[PDB]
Design a protein around this ligand. Structure first.
Ligand SMILES: *C(=O)[C@H](CCC[C@H](N)C(=O)O)NC(=O)CC[C@@H](N)C(=O)O
Length: 492
């Protein structure tokens, strides 16, 4: 298959690189077979967009086409460049349209490594019009999220890009922890690395030999920006981020900017949990009506990025221990600690369909193998239940949901990856009250027995993974707990 254009030989390598020759030739024929990319500023603008996608590292497709474009350009093969650019712009338009629909597959469950379906007729009309007006640069901009949050990441990207290769000494210290009052060997590298993330360094005193008062606010601001405990102590967590290179920050800005294409913005009614920020928000009628900290899955039992809906609440839930938890976690402890089941208010039941309670005294524990244990565990409802007082049921293929917790001290931690995958909600009682108020449900008598409550209006729940974002006028960075930034960072 060869692109039917006079000024492209059938033997040209672009015939193997073009994903949609039929549509590309029609666009040219509709435009009198004129070149679309003869304005270098327009070529530059599209390569700069592809360079963001390339650095983000989620798309072998776009990386492959960018490398081919740059090669044709280095050789002044502008006719080939022209047709490959036009093909690649159709892929970009499809990417822009498809990201919010299926993009999880490109960022979290795989990569964008195969060509996409052609963009919509609306995109194809906007392209035809843009070609007529030589407004391709504006078209590309219109197919970015029209969202100040996205533009804040791209603005920082553009600032840092201009100083990417300036030498900045690493911050070094002799001891593991440096506290206010301690001598400092590397004050200048420290102040330069605070300045790199746009913190006000103008009141830091020059040539002071120790961690003085003038450094304390900037250090705590740096800690807060990176989600660290704001203890003022320059330890390994603080230094990891101080010593992050501009190249690595640019990778994080690019990947996080492109991830914004995935996430819904409608505030009709939505719940969003950002895993690596360990927080959540609930919007009703276009307003934030609830926010709280959360606990999320341990790195070995990760909370998946997913879309689901909140179908129902259980007030005073029991906990039906999943088979895998029973076998791997609990029964080994039961075998070694004859007070475990009483202490955790856990009953042995014949099965879910047959909740006959069996006294653990009636079982020969010596003979029990967790793997073959034929009964099930059910934790009684109450304030010490692992689900607390509230289960927020969000049915999905990974069996993830939201719940209250008796372990509320964990919300005081800066890093909150403690669960088996589920999301534990701080102020769960307030979340339930707000949900049920908005649904036109309220209990005149608060049950002290288990009660399942169907939502009348199902609420979309978006579990997202955003390690850089803009909020209250500043950028926030978070540790890549599930290693989804790892390929972009280059850190193996
Ligand atoms: C959520 O994590 C839940 C287990 C109950 C809550 C837990 N104790 C917590 O750590 O917050 N579900 C799962 O762990 C998934 C288990 C899966 N095998 C299943 O079928 O339920």
């Amino acid at each position: 298959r060869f692109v039917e254009l006079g000024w492209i030989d059938s033997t040209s390598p672009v015939n193997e690189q073009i994903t949609n020759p039929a549509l590309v030739e029609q666009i040219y024929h509709s435009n009198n077979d004129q070149l679309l990319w003869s304005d270098l500023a327009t070529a530059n603008h599209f390569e700069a967009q592809l360079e963001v996608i390339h650095r983000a590292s989620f798309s072998p497709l776009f990386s492959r086409q960018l490398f081919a474009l740059k090669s044709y350009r280095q050789q002044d093969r502008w006719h080939e460049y022209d047709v490959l650019a036009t093909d690649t712009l159709l892929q970009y338009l499809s990417y822009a349209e498809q990201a919010p629909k299926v993009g999880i597959a490109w960022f979290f469950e795989g990569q964008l490594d195969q060509p996409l379906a052609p963009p919509s007729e609306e995109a194809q009309l906007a392209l035809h019009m843009a070609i007529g007006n030589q407004s391709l640069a504006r078209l590309m901009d219109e197919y970015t999220p029209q969202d100040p949050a996205y533009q804040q990441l791209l603005q920082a990207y553009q600032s840092l890009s201009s100083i990417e290769f300036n030498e900045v000494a690493l911050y070094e210290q002799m001891e593991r922890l440096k506290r206010p009052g301690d001598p400092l060997s590397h004050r200048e590298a420290l102040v330069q690395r605070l300045a790199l993330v746009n913190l006000d360094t103008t009141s830091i005193l020059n040539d002071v030999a120790y961690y003085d008062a003038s450094l304390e606010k900037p250090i705590k601001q740096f800690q807060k920006m990176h989600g660290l405990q704001t203890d003022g102590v320059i330890g390994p967590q603080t230094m990891k981020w101080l010593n992050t290179s501009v190249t690595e920050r640019l990778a994080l800005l690019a990947l996080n900017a492109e991830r914004i294409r995935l996430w819904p913005t409608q505030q009709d009614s939505m719940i969003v949990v950002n895993v690596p920020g360990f927080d959540m928000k609930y919007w009703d009628a276009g307003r934030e009506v609830f926010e709280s900290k959360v606990v999320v899955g341990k790195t070995t039992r990760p909370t998946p990025v997913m879309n689901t809906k909140l179908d129902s609440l259980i007030i005073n839930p029991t906990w039906n221990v999943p088979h895998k938890i029973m076998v791997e976690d609990i029964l080994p402890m039961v075998k070694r600690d004859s007070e475990y089941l009483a202490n955790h208010h856990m009953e042995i039941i014949r099965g879910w369909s047959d909740p006959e309670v069996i006294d653990p005294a009636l079982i020969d524990w010596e003979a029990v193998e967790p793997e073959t244990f034929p009964y099930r565990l059910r934790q009684q409802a109450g304030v010490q239940n692992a689900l607390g007082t509230y289960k927020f049921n969000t049915p999905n293929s990974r069996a993830i949901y939201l719940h209250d917790t008796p372990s509320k001290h964990l919300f005081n931690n800066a890093s909150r990856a403690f669960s088996s995958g589920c999301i534990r909600v701080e102020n769960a009682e307030k979340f339930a009250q707000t949900l049920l108020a908005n649904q036109g449900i309220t209990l005149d008598d608060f049950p002290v027995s288990t009660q399942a409550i169907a939502l009348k209006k199902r609420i979309p729940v978006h579990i997202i993974y955003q390690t850089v974002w803009y909020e209250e006028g500043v950028l926030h960075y978070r540790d890549d707990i599930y290693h989804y930034d790892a390929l972009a960072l280059g850190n193996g």
